[PDB]
Amino acid sequence: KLDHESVTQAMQPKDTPELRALYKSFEEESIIPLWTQLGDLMPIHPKSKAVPHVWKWSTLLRLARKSGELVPVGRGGERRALGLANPGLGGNAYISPTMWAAIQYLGPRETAPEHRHSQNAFRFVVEGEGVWTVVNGDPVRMSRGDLLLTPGWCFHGHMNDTDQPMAWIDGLDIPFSQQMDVGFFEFGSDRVTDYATPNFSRGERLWCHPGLRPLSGLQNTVASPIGAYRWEFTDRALTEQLLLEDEGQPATVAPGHAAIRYVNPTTGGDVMPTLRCEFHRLRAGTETATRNEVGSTVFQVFEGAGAVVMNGETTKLEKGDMFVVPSWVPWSLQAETQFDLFRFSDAPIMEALSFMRTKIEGQ
Amino acid sequence: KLDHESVTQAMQPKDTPELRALYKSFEEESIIPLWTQLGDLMPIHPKSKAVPHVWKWSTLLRLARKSGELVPVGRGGERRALGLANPGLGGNAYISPTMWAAIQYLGPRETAPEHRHSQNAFRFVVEGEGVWTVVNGDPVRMSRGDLLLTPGWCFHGHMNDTDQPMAWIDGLDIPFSQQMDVGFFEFGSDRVTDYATPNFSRGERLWCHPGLRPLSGLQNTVASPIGAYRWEFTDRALTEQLLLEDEGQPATVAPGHAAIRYVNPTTGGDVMPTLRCEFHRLRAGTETATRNEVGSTVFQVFEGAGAVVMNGETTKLEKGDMFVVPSWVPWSLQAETQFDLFRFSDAPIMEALSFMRTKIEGQ
Amino acid sequence: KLDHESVTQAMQPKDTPELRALYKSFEEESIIPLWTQLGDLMPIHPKSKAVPHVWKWSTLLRLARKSGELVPVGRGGERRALGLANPGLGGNAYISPTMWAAIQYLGPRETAPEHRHSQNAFRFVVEGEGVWTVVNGDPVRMSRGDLLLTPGWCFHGHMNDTDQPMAWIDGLDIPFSQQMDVGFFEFGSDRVTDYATPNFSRGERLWCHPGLRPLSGLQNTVASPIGAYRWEFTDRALTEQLLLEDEGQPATVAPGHAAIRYVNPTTGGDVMPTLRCEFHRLRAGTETATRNEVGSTVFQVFEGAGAVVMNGETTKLEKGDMFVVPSWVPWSLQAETQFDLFRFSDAPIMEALSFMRTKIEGQ
Amino acid sequence: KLDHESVTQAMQPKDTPELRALYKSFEEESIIPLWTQLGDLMPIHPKSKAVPHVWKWSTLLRLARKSGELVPVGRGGERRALGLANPGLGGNAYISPTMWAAIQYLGPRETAPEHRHSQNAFRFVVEGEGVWTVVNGDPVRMSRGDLLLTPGWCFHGHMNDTDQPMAWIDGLDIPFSQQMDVGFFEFGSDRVTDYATPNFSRGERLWCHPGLRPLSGLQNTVASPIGAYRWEFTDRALTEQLLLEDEGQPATVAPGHAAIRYVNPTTGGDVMPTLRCEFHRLRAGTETATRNEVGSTVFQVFEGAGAVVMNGETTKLEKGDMFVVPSWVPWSLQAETQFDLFRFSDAPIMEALSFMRTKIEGQ
Numbered sequence A, B, C, D: 001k002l003d004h005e006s007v008t009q010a011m012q013p014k015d016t017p018e019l020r021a022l023y024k025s026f027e028e029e030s031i032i033p034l035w036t037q038l039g040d041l042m043p044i045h046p047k048s049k050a051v052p053h054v055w056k057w058s059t060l061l062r063l064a065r066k067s068g069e070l071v072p073v074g075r076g077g078e079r080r081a082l083g084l085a086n087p088g089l090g091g092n093a094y095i096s097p098t099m100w101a102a103i104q105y106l107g108p109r110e111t112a113p114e115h116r117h118s119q120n121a122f123r124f125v126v127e128g129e130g131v132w133t134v135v136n137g138d139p140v141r142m143s144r145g146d147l148l149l150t151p152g153w154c155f156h157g158h159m160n161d162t163d164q165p166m167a168w169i170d171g172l173d174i175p176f177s178q179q180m181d182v183g184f185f186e187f188g189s190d191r192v193t194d195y196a197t198p199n200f201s202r203g204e205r206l207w208c209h210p211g212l213r214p215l216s217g218l219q220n221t222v223a224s225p226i227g228a229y230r231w232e233f234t235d236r237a238l239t240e241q242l243l244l245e246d247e248g249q250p251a252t253v254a255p256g257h258a259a260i261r262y263v264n265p266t267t268g269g270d271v272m273p274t275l276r277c278e279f280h281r282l283r284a285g286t287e288t289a290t291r292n293e294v295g296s297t298v299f300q301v302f303e304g305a306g307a308v309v310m311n312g313e314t315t316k317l318e319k320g321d322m323f324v325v326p327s328w329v330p331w332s333l334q335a336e337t338q339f340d341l342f343r344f345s346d347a348p349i350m351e352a353l354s355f356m357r358t359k360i361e362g363q
């Protein structure tokens, strides 16, 4: 089938003074013709400006740690968060066209003051403890393996209750929101509104009992009311899938590939309107079938060792390393040991708007 | 406002030979005129043929136990289940116009053979253990406080793995299904297809991790894929609600009234298309506000002591006792000690069809 | 596969004084055992008490006309409507277990006073004119071929603006509503609230422009806000389908079988929560493939000549004749001339509750 | 309340060699810190790079006409479409961050060859006739006042059947699709696949009968199957609203302001997943209340004379003139004569993702 390089170009006008005058009037009148731009504007398949890229956790940690020494956290700058900037996205602090990802660092006894914004956000922890994030006044402990949510427009601030630093990753729909013009922002309290440090938040104490819904929470929500998806449950779910597979029972998405989607328990859908969160566990030796998927995804290695292949290029990966797969880039994971990864993506956007497509090798 | 007793009856024809001949032709031609039937067919508010009624657990147990002595369980009759028959429903084995409820009794080492039917069903246990119910080949342990589901068209049979008898209650949409003509039925295996007795079923091992969904289970279901809602989770959820109330935090539906709805985790909706299951826990001294609700509900006392008021009549209640509240009958619960009750209803039917109405005293 | 007649009956207790005493205690305690009732309560496939039956329009007209002479219309009896009573439904004025159908007759200058009720209702006209039905104060002309709606809880009354009588058919969910206990009813004005007789109602003037929705009507409704589905549109739609078929283009449901569903334009779904309305037009010679469908349906012949086959029995049909197909009864239509039929059913109930099943001969 | 200009900037590190070295390592490692970017990335309310702007139809026509003389239409460039480029969007052929708008010109007997692409598209006509657009093989006449749809992935080409030129406007989600990486594109036939010029398309002959749905079209669609929303219906709907207002009846969105939304008749929702189309008619003298709305909108004056106010600035408008209102820009319309406008927007994106907000003056 023809592409933009092989098709006949039948709209090539004669290069005369009249043509050049027409084209000068276009500039003056804020007009740009489709016929000179077609192939750029409307590619055969997606061709992102973002490139696949890997950031090493050892490098992220060094830069975050040095930032903890040299930059105080507080009002204005709001957070000591270091955004991952895709080399292909022109100097914008965007890991992909839709998503922001950052390593955030909070030192001994620091607080990061309360604010809210339309942009949706989550926190994920490969390692560490000591921080509580207070979401609409509800303190939520942050620990290794936990997904924490802060849906758009919820007040949130954080405090380190400890004499030891903690780091984690943030994901937000900042780049989508900046480009599409949906951002609103409000400064809240200079200190978190509750310094208490309970083991479990009020949201969890209501919503984290499997298959049960409070009669006071019968209205569905656009975002999950669960503030913490704790490691204990994620680990148990993934283990049970591999055990069910051992027993000859359906459960894994693919052979030796256990995986869950974190969900809004009021609907069974995605945690937030713009962001999908998953967790994958591959047995030693597993090699996933190559996928092309519309929209972008980011993974963080939680545990074990393995590799990612993107555009045919293998990169070895270790605990904490992060990678981005832009739209339609062919990708696969290869597990050396048992290989655990946290994943996020802009797939709820693509699916809501009927733009999603998937190609899987061998099917 | 006028009712059918106080309105003028302006369609009263002269009682002549011609009128009586007209009315005889109506009988011959299978015609029945609205004008002689209006008030019956279309009441001012619902007036059920079912009456409020209470069955004592001590009486249910005696009859079930004697049935265990005198009647063998097996093919044909299928189950040793004793249906609660509303005195107002003309000899039909219906607790309400929509619902069947029964005490079922399975003796030492008995099996009840496998079958399936379009009618949706659940099991609830106030006391006992030893039985496994095998649902589409997945053995599901039955224990005190557990809700077990068997959605329409799932093969199910049960076996007592023990030398001791067990009793439980069944709820089904049998009366709805019989009157509306939606019943299909298929005999399966004469013995259960798996005699293994695991602590937890495969359904639970996949689906009972709070806020997590397997990537192999991304299609929504019409009924919950959770085969067991275990007492441990229900008890914890209800306790946390009362604790949150202690802490000044929203959670209970009403003061001292904790309550959950069992839900399909794929949608956040009801367990099955025709049947809603809830569990309520009232602090000692709680008296619920009087409700009128369209459609019928049945409760079983799980624990504690208290009373129900129906149509203004108080009946004292004990562990295991069962009562039915027909459509639009005013009802309230009064808790003497801490008072725990399992509840089921036909409310998903009423709500699906936009017939639901609720009146709550003092609001 | 086994049925209830061929299965072994393994729950047959020894007929002793102790057994008979047990069974007497069951009666005293309002208990009815499943084992003596199983096959009745839970049939292999639906076996309705309703039977297929045909009512002749010439007979309906004679009885309605005589009723117009002998019975005045007004308060109390409310409407001069003659309900079609299924011979199998025990003297209940029910055409099926879910639906009421009636021929209603309004003589010269009569009014039928305003009321409302939870039961949903529609009017269909095989022939006649002169009546306006005033629905929540909006006068809606009634003419040949028109479907008129009156969703539950809308005030409605009717008046004949003419010196000539008119007859039509009513359909309601009266039998569903009576058996399920969802009926509420309120008397309104003794006269219609607006005697004006516009050609088109306000509802239609807002809602009957194809593919357009008023910005003041962006909230979805549970029932259609279109008060009249006029013959002109139904006829044009059916004709265009047969023309598209002539042109080799997809459109008809089956060869020579044009058909539409009347829909709620806010959702694209059924006109009312409990009732589905369709209109079918078959070319001369068309014989539809035999269907078994869960739930009941009623047709009225609008025009042309043909036959229905039910349970293998052929009945010839003429203009106005009405027939009922109970749940799971095999049925087919045979067209002698071009054959037009209006159809209603309880299918939205069956589909909402996941009870629908369909068997089509040759597929 | 604080904004980014008035808040204290508490994250200002000491400008030392160590800090500058840290910041150099950030560049080297593709890291950009939040603390230097916060206010840009996360504004108090949306602050688009797009600016309000007006393009005159007389200018668009001159440039399109000259393009018809100097540039041939055909393969490669695909369409002689002149995109409206927002002065604030850096040289991108985008009228807003989400939407493309263009004047397209097709001369006597020209054809524009068939292609398809994931990007959704529509055509609107302020004036002219003679072109047919062939959509998945179904020829759709284009005439004054018509909205034509071409949902993503439908093959489409166009041909002028006449010796006279025609111009119209195109709207697409090109800028959304380019930035979010969802574009796929396929070249089809070099000539349209059907040169026939029927008055009405097959889609319309099936789908444009108010409140009726073909039994062969019971599956819902993500986009409307109506290929043409003809002027006749839009005009009648708007007139009826103003008449109902005359009669004291609810209908208009605001006093003297009639308006419709073009809808997908299978769902009652928007025509396509990314684009909302409306048509407004204001009585002489009407001044709409000032709105701020999230996301962008574009209007074209269809008929009459009036003005738009954006950011407090009044611009007088005539037949065919086009304007863009970027996200959150305050806007109002003022009608001198009776004032008719076609409107499109990215609102289905904002609403699907829960980003929509609206401020209306005086409420």
Ligand SMILES: O=C(O)c1cc(O)ccc1O
Pocket (backbone or CB within 6 Å): A079, A081, A082, A101, A102, A104, A121, A156, A170, A171, A172, D034
């Ligand atoms: O609230 C946060 O911690 C936050 C973290 C980020 O990386 C970017 C924006 C934010 O608002």
Ligand SMILES: O=C(O)c1cc(O)ccc1O
Pocket (backbone or CB within 6 Å): B079, B081, B082, B101, B102, B104, B121, B156, B170, B171, B172, C034
């Ligand atoms: O499958 C059962 O245990 C069952 C129990 C009942 O009480 C009634 C019908 C049934 O099919």
Ligand SMILES: O=C(O)c1cc(O)ccc1O
Pocket (backbone or CB within 6 Å): B034, C079, C081, C082, C101, C102, C104, C121, C156, C170, C171, C172
């Ligand atoms: O309102 C009516 O015309 C009506 C007609 C019927 O056949 C039965 C009940 C009703 O309320």
Ligand SMILES: O=C(O)c1cc(O)ccc1O
Pocket (backbone or CB within 6 Å): A034, D079, D081, D082, D101, D102, D104, D121, D156, D170, D171, D172
């Ligand atoms: O198909 C079209 O006519 C078209 C028109 C545009 O203005 C831009 C892209 C397109 O594909």
Ligand SMILES: [Fe+2]
Pocket (backbone or CB within 6 Å): A115, A117, A121, A156
């Ligand atoms: Fe934040």
Ligand SMILES: [Fe+2]
Pocket (backbone or CB within 6 Å): B115, B117, B121, B156
């Ligand atoms: Fe059963």
Ligand SMILES: [Fe+2]
Pocket (backbone or CB within 6 Å): C115, C117, C121, C156
């Ligand atoms: Fe009525």
Ligand SMILES: [Fe+2]
Pocket (backbone or CB within 6 Å): D115, D117, D121, D156
């Ligand atoms: Fe195109």
